[model samples]
Target: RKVLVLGSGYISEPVLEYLSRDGNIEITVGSDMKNQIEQLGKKYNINPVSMDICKQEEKLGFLVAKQDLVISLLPYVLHPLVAKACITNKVNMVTASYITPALKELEKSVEDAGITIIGELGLDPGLDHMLAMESIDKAKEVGATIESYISYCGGLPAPEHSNNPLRYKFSWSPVGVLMNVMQSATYLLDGKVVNVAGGISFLDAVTSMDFFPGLNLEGYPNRDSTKYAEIYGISSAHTLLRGTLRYKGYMKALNGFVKLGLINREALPNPLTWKQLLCDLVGISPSSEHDVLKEAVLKKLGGDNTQLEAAEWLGLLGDEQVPQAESILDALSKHLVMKLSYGPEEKDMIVMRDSFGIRHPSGHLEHKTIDLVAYGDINGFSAMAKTVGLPTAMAAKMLLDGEIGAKGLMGPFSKEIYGPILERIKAEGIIYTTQSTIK
Candidate 1:
């Protein structure tokens, strides 16, 4: 069957490469940038077409007409356009974005079109969804009562880079990164619904796994953990929490930004320049150079402001001056320097752990922890992309290969689709491990 992959951004590369490897499948990639398409096509030996999908009805129709499956790596906002086109053309499509109400609204139409619309097929929503489903199924089988469920996932530089502070880089979209830092998260605690601003509430580490040491990482509750409780089959009485992971000491630094209002997304009426306002609000010292704005900002916000502390807090800061590069910016100077310690060979890791309380029909209750860790060879592509991108690509491939015969819009990691697809993913090195106890 012919496969059409959309977009050519950082997240799209792995999907392109993975799909191209199947010799039986003919792959055609469509991107708005002709030069990027050509370069990718040359590198992967696939058909390349330059088409602006924003002109959806025309470009998507023509493209989907020829291809049996379409993989959309487009932005989240553009998913509806692709869904509309896929429905019209009866072409199955897979994406790594969350399922918007708009996209979910198309369920009946997609089913009627006999086309599968797979959403949330990327990292957090993607693999996390699947792994959770698998664990829940296993819990049910063992007659365990699933009482609590928690999932945490993040992408960071490997060990060498872990020594630096900030513990993160622009591994993915910066806007999304910035937005997440400023947003509030929702979850359940002891059956009580709780809403807390992101980077506001801090978590103390209770356990340290050797595999993900230094992830002595603090976690803040993610928005909408309650939604997943239903998705993962946890009862209302059970505690459900979902969160983003970060390196040790990462929360304090970020909390400083939020508390100081530097990361606020809420609108301000007064017209003040972002830098000046931020500096004034955060009380940066006048002697601080422009280059040290972030450091200065962090200092005033009560972050550990020492050179070693800064180096430890932001992986980008270190003892040596980062080589002057055109790509370096005032905000990202530290990140750039910190990234040097990581190489393409050093794979980034993505970890998700979910503990479920399940009650069996036989009146037995057990606790189960489903853990997944995926590592990607350095090249800066990270385990984050692999775990997120591979599932998305695999779903698209399953649609093309007729492995997933589901009709309508679906998320990654359902019992029916997730079981088989996750097995395949495990074979591709995305393994899910489990632990359980009967009480």
Candidate 2:
């Protein structure tokens, strides 16, 4: 089968390499960076082509027609545009991004065209969704009625690598991290909707996360989880939530960013300096004395000291030059790219957990925790890329092998798609451990 991998990026390299190992599958990599893409293709022994996917419609059509399947490793927003081309050319496509409204709207056409467009097939969204369904389905096998479902996942720095005050080292885009900090979210808490404002997205909503010995972490709702109760076939569930986990103080510090408008991307002129931005937002001294800003921040955020101290440690008050950006959020994202990144020999970590409250037919209640932890190798692929990219690659292999044959917008939840992918990746040291207790 001819496989076309889109975009040469941190994740794409692994996907291409993984797919190439099969030898029988022909591969083509498309990207604007000819040098880099060609270098990767040569190393992986695949064909390399140059085409600006954002332009040259006829060119994109030709490429799509050549592939039996396409995996978009590009930016999330651009997937729909590529999906449109795939639909016209009668090709199947896959992505690691969440299915957007545009993709949903095209479902009929895609199904009518007898092709598939699968998304949310990456690490957090991909593995998280697949594993959650697996566990939920198993619980049902024992004739269990699930009451509550809670899931949390994050890509963090390993303990030794977590030397920074923020306790995070970006294995992915810093901008994406900051951008999500201010999104409004809704989730079920005790069968009622709990809303978190952009300013308080993670405020006071942390669950004490205990994954490793002597490790401190927290979790908050990731986004609107109201639909997931039904999406996961658990409408009977009383509480359902999907959240992101971070080292202790990460969310609180991020709340400071929200409360201070550090990550706000609203239509506003960009600030000139970090110091000017903080002073302007909170009416603080340009010098940003810890006590002054602390008092002001704590007063605004209701006696929050750790968050303020974290903000200070992050250098939000220093006279750091802002990059070319249109908003404070963009500037700060760039600022963090410089400060809160992984150092040499520092390995990133990916943590995921799913908890289910189940009652068996035998009149006994149980709580189950499914846990997954992955770390990067100093001289190899980061945990983020391996976990995110391998699943996508495995899905492509499954598609050609006839393991995935549905003809509509799809993710990795289906047994044919996820079960085999999970089984295969186990050899690569990606596995989920389960714990259960009678309640």
Candidate 3:
């Protein structure tokens, strides 16, 4: 079997590691970066194609036509075009991204082509779904009605490395992380649908979870949870929520930033010192003394000195001038990226927990939770990369064995798709623990 992998990125290492173990399968990696493609090709001893998916459809199609499967590790925005090429070439494709409406729009085409296009096969959407379904199905088998479903997932710096104000480090783009904060959210709660407006409201709505005593964690709803009732076959559930997690004070600091108009895309007037820019944000004079500036900013933040202290820690309150950026949000993203990046020897971690409230037919209630915590290999892949990439590779392997019979736009939300992949990932050391109590 031949596989065409797109985007030789941070997550690509684990995928290559797992797939290359099978000597029978041939692998080809494609990327716009010539150096990345060459590096991966030499390391994996596989075919390398230096091509841009946006500018080179013909070249992409040429490669897609020859491969038995295409694993799109590219950005989620590019998946639709990649899927188009796969359909044109009658080849299957796998992605770890959520199935966007664009991919869904290709449903009939994917069906007509008789090729599989599976997505959400990565960490949050990937493992989260598999773990949820396994327990959800088991409960249903025993005639238990799911009463509540709440899941929390995060990719964070290990405790020893979480010394920064945000207590987070980017394994991906910092701009992408900042942009996600602006999205609105909707979830099911107490049999009623709850909607949260994006930006300040979303950040402010962050709630705390103390299941893990050692970590200070807070969560806010991620995207739409109301749809998951149908997706997870848990219509009987009264509460449904899937959330993104961060350290305890993350939201407070971010909320202050968002409220200060620091996270906006409006162009800056000119290159200026971060102190001046921040002073202007809160309508204070730039030339004020540091102590005065701190007082005003603290007041603006509703007396939350941690957020003010965080700004100071990021050098935003210092005299250092910021790099010329297209927007304030870009400047902030760059600033955070520089300050919050993990040191070479520092490790990262992935924390995921899923909670279920079930009512058994025997008149007993069960509270169950599944937790997965993995730390990065300082010498190898980060926890985020392994959790995101390995599952895609596993799904690709399944496709090679002709195990995934379903074709068209879909995810690992079903037993047929997730069962074997979950089992295989366990042996790879990407495992989770489950606990339940009946009352």
- lDDT, residue 96, model 2: 85
**Residues 104-205, model 3: lDDT tens digits:** 887888899888888898887889888998998899899988999998888888988767788788775588778878888999899889999988777668
Return the TM-score for candidate 1, rounded to 2 decimals: 0.82
Candidates ranked by TM-score: 3, 2, 1
Per-model TM-score, in order, reads: 0.82, 0.89, 0.93
List of clashing residue pairs for candidate 3:
none
Deviation in Å, model 1, residue 213 alpha carbon: 6.5
Tens-digit lDDT track of model 2 for 25-49: 8988888887888678656887878
Q: How good is model 2 by TM-score? A: 0.89
Q: Tell how far residue 8 is off in model 3, in angstroms.
A: 1.9
RMSD to the true structure for each prediction, in A, is: 5.3, 3.1, 2.2
Best by lDDT: 3
Poorest 10 consecutive residues of model 2 by lDDT?
A: 266-275
Q: Which regions of candidate 3 fall more than 4 Å away from where they truly are?
A: 283-299
RMSD of 1: 5.3
